[PDB]
Design an enzyme around this catalytic site. Structure first.
Site, short mmCIF file in Angstrom:
data_model
loop_
_atom_site.label_atom_id
_atom_site.label_comp_id
_atom_site.label_asym_id
_atom_site.label_seq_id
_atom_site.Cartn_x
_atom_site.Cartn_y
_atom_site.Cartn_z
N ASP A 65 56.42 77.57 47.89
CA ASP A 65 56.62 76.50 46.91
C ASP A 65 55.55 76.54 45.82
O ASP A 65 55.86 76.36 44.64
CB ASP A 65 56.62 75.13 47.59
CG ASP A 65 57.90 74.89 48.39
OD1 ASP A 65 58.99 75.19 47.87
OD2 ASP A 65 57.81 74.39 49.53
N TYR A 113 63.82 69.25 49.48
CA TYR A 113 62.59 68.79 50.07
C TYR A 113 61.70 68.06 49.08
O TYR A 113 61.61 68.31 47.88
CB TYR A 113 61.73 69.88 50.74
CG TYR A 113 62.14 70.06 52.16
CD1 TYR A 113 62.34 71.34 52.72
CD2 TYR A 113 62.35 68.94 52.96
CE1 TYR A 113 62.73 71.48 54.06
CE2 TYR A 113 62.73 69.05 54.31
CZ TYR A 113 62.91 70.35 54.85
OH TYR A 113 63.30 70.54 56.16
CU LIG Z 1 61.09 70.61 57.81
#
Ligand SMILES: [Cu+2]
Ligand SMILES: [Cu+2]
Lengths: 620, 620
Positions: B290, B374
């Site tokens: 990320d 996320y």
């Molecule tokens: Cu997770």
């Protein structure tokens, strides 16, 4: 109405009257423990019967008694004479503490040792500490305390700054005789004071802190009914208080739609031990069983609003018995409040355009106790998402010694000439489980690594495995942080909507367990502390991991004896006992008063619900 | 004035103008990364030269460049052409993510795959994901994204509830070519929706939650000067923001009486990897860097007062560059506030009669990022007592798949037919240490058990051992929770009043590290994640544990190459790299939106101060 209501002052006065009229509470008797008994297993028990268990000490040397009383009927149910050389001595009495210093003050060997050190006997405080069981055969069957000396330069002085090392005394507190005085050599008494309210030490107080105001303009979100029954954000529970264990949580359950689903039947800290790791003969016997030997509930603090508990606080003021059977109220002894706990769930979705944030909250139930130099806070937390957490907060003043010239492998230096012996603080949580009912089982869950090969050609796969603990002989488990080891408590007869057994996962902090040699006295008396997790079959009389009478018991009582029965625990009424603790190598920053350090554990649902249980939390 | 001030909109516009003037930012160019460079080692040498590092992508296929410019002097300092097949591709551009779904919507292999499943192409969302390095030779030197498909039933529907398993496509986002479409078979698309704002799913919202009001009537206790310099309760620091790393803390120091004492020169999360453990060829390539591939600061949320940050909040609004060099403000992207943190220290002393209670508080610096499904919160905490803590909060929607009939060892079932593959979330903290200055060293500290015998006759002694890490080759360390292993960063040339080196102790959570097979692509690219602690000698160009160019880069860069220099780290300018992460076996309670789970680490003073540093906190 509830069988789980707190003991009232009137109940304790009735117990006193019943004991007195039965001839069991003469002037030579002392109540060393008094507590309510929980109701027996019976999901249909209606007949109210409030029973109390009492340990009765005799100051003239007669054998003590264990008595069970019915307050409801006004009767003595049973009275048994105890043979303490076999089954252990009764807990230490508050009034025996001051006896140790008074008796040494007239003992010629003690006075000789103080005179050599040029110490005024009127300035010497003696910490009265539990004796344990070691090599002294003359102590078997007698109530012994051991004394360590500290100098108090003036009435408001912190005596902990001035240990008198190289000196220890043993005292029989019933026959009132000093059995031994051991003087291993003269150590300088550290001279710096440790008075943390002295402006000379603190310097000018900070003027930079601005107020933080935490209010609830509409009152708190929980209700309290029947004195100690809590309802909060789908949780339901009863808050008990026992003079030995402190705060006890009963009937923890969660309202899932229209069903009140049990989770834990009874939760408590059932023992806590503080073993010291200094091999000096002055201290190598030193091990505090704060719960079993001292009774942490009777030393509970009164908590001050805005200082100890901040916010919109609801207090409980539990009642205990004094040594004579009179009720004594611990005013504001338990704090209950809710607090904000940050973000609960958050997602900003590109495709749907929906931005979603919700905040979390926890319910806090806490009390604080003071045992000599140490102060411990006990905190239970309930969270919106079904998580249950316990946290112990350790503060107070570290126990001190001289710091030897040349150094030490077992003692930290805090100040010139002032040492702090290495030690641990180890707790045992007893969790009488009731996951969707009493048919429960425990599984150990480890991460499983997989080797690159057929069916895993890129070497990315990993998995997990669960092992059912089926008998008590196989239910003594160790942590393994490297494999992510956790334990799942499930109900094999209650499935979620995916046809999986409902469960809760225990998450440990994986701190070291008891470090003492396995052959030592403390490893035998605190065997619970040598392993992270124990599972037993429930039984009414298996209450403490160290047995009923911890003081001066030779060892093996409690969990090793229980586990030896090797009972079936696969889908049965079971109890989980979790050991967790802090290993304390004192640092300079711990002196002269120690900032809080913490340890604990938590349990999180694992397929207990059919989806997230906090979808109905509003945005506010 | 301060060299550590946030980049301003004017500086970013000036970088754009300088690059354009130099002929480096024509219409075919895109800025993939832009950030300010920290001052070089040298106490105020450059007077002030504000320098920016820029990665420039070329949409026509020409080689990209790395460029350093001085905005102060209006000059390009250096410009280097990059050979991306050797040293790595540039980070993914936001505009490339949109390309993937549109290109697939016209490819006959993709449409044939969807027609086989009776799916309408207009309803199929494609998640565009980083490609990694695997067996496909045609990808070397090309910018590739891989796409996985999800059905969105209507515009506000959560597409994550409807994964289209058995199908993946690879796309060249520069040449706009679909290179491969892989269809391993038809899976039913799970039909239940996951719309966590739908009243049909939430039920009626709770009316039981009463408000909690947190206010500061006199304002906060911290000051902000120069835009981003913070002073709070003896702490001093600068809050930076970088588009790659996110919030960066500089010059963390503590005012100890008259002296400003440095502790940490630079603290950041310098990489984070999310590897998936499902061996299906549809997902066995799935690993998110990320930080390194996506740039987490670019996707920072605007934080809403009262929802995201509660209390008396001070905001920073950092400025970043868009892909054309125009400044873009992330409005309210950083929250700063202080929080009450319970009891700090407490003791009720029998002998002195003094009762003493003080409260703790912490300063919070946080931001939140969203990458696809996320959402991650990054929290830095400073406490009154000298503790520094980091906490990551993971939430959002779990990544889904089909749940195979007959089960899976690598996927959790969340709903009928709906699975969630196992995965980890692993962070790397880069701590450029400066404990009382730059001469530092690291010691590993283990508990030592002692056997009963001579000099330890009662078997109670325990001790500890410290091992100095002297060279980089021995400074790659693993956790050992069972021996209580910690690491101490000390300054051997700066001693406390007891003549011991001042230090700080690093306490890890001891969670599992990377689980993938050591020969896997992800283990080579994320080598940092295989060990808990690394120590390097400071160097200007050793910024990220994965190297500068992570996207589609094989191993060969980052921490294993740095450590091979085997430099002296014993009393030198050193950098600590700590790996910590969550291992996520999804539970039913994680669906349809996940309650926060957390991980982190903390640093505590270890003989840094001469006594407790919070004796001057007032009673309130
Ligand atoms: Cu997770
Ligand atoms: Cu301690």
């Amino acid at each position: 109405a509830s069988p789980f209501r707190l003991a009232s002052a009137g109940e304790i006065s009735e117990v006193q009257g019943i004991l007195r009229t039965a001839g069991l509470l003469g002037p030579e008797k002392r109540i060393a423990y008094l507590g309510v008994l929980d109701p027996a297993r019976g999901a249909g028990s209606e007949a109210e019967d409030r029973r109390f268990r009492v340990f009765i000490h005799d100051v003239s040397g007669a054998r003590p008694q264990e008595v069970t009383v019915s307050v409801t009927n006004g009767t003595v149910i049973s009275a048994v004479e105890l043979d303490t050389a076999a089954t252990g001595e009764l807990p230490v009495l508050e009034e025996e503490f001051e006896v140790v210093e008074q008796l040494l003050a007239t003992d010629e060997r003690w006075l000789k040792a103080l005179a050599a050190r040029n110490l005024d006997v009127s300035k010497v405080r003696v910490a009265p500490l539990s004796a344990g069981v070691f090599e002294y055969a003359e102590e078997r069957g007698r109530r012994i305390l051991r004394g360590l000396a500290f100098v108090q330069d003036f009435p408001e002085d912190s005596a902990w700054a001035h240990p008198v090392d190289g000196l220890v005394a043993y005292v029989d507190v019933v026959s009132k005789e000093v059995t031994r005085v051991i003087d291993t050599g003269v150590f300088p008494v550290p001279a710096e004071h440790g008075n943390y309210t002295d402006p000379e030490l603190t310097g000018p107080l900070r003027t930079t802190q601005k107020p933080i105001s935490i209010t609830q303009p509409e009152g708190p979100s929980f209700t309290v009914t029947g004195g100690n029954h809590i309802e909060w954000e789908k949780w339901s529970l009863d808050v008990g208080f026992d003079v030995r264990e402190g705060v006890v949580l009963h009937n923890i359950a969660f309202r899932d739609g229209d069903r009140l689903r049990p989770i834990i039947n009874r939760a408590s800290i059932a023992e806590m031990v503080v073993p010291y790791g200094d091999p000096s003969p002055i201290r190598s016997w030193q091990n505090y069983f704060d719960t079993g030997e001292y009774l942490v509930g009777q030393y509970a603090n009164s908590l001050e609003l805005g200082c100890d508990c901040l916010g919109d606080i609801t207090y409980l003021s539990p009642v205990i018995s004094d040594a004579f059977g009179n009720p004594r109220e611990i005013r504001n002894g338990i704090c209950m409040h809710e607090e904000d706990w940050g973000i609960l769930a958050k997602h900003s979705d590109l495709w749907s355009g929906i931005n979603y944030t919700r905040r979390n909250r926890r319910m806090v139930i806490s009390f604080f106790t003071t045992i000599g130099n140490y102060d411990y806070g006990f905190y239970w937390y309930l969270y919106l998402d079904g998580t249950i957490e316990f946290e112990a907060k350790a503060t107070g003043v570290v126990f001190t010694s001289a710091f030897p010239e040349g150094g030490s492998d077992n003692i930290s230096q805090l100040a010139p000439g002032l040492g702090a012996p290495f030690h641990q603080h180890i707790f045992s949580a007893r969790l009488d489980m009731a996951i969707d009912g009493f048919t429960n089982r425990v599984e150990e869950e480890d991460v499983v690594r997989q080797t690159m090969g057929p069916g895993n050609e890129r070497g990315n796969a990993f998995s997990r495995k669960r092992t059912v603990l089926t008998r008590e002989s196989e239910a003594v488990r160790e942590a393994d942080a490297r494999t992510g080891r956790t334990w799942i408590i499930s109900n094999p007869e209650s499935k979620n909507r995916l046809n999986e057994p409902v469960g809760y996962k225990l998450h440990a902090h994986n701190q070291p367990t008891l470090l003492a040699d396995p052959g030592s006295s403390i490893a035998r008396r605190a065997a619970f502390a040598t392993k992270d997790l124990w599972v037993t079959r429930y039984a009414d009389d298996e209450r403490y991991p160290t047995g009923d009478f911890v003081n001066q018991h030779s060892g093996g009582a409690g969990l090793p004896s229980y586990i030896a029965q090797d009972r079936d625990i696969d889908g049965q009424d079971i109890v989980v006992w979790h050991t967790f603790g802090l290993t304390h190598f004192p640092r300079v920053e711990d002196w002269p008063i120690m900032p809080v350090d913490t340890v604990g554990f938590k349990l999180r649902p694992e397929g207990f619900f059919d989806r997230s249980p906090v979808l109905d939390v509003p945005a506010n």
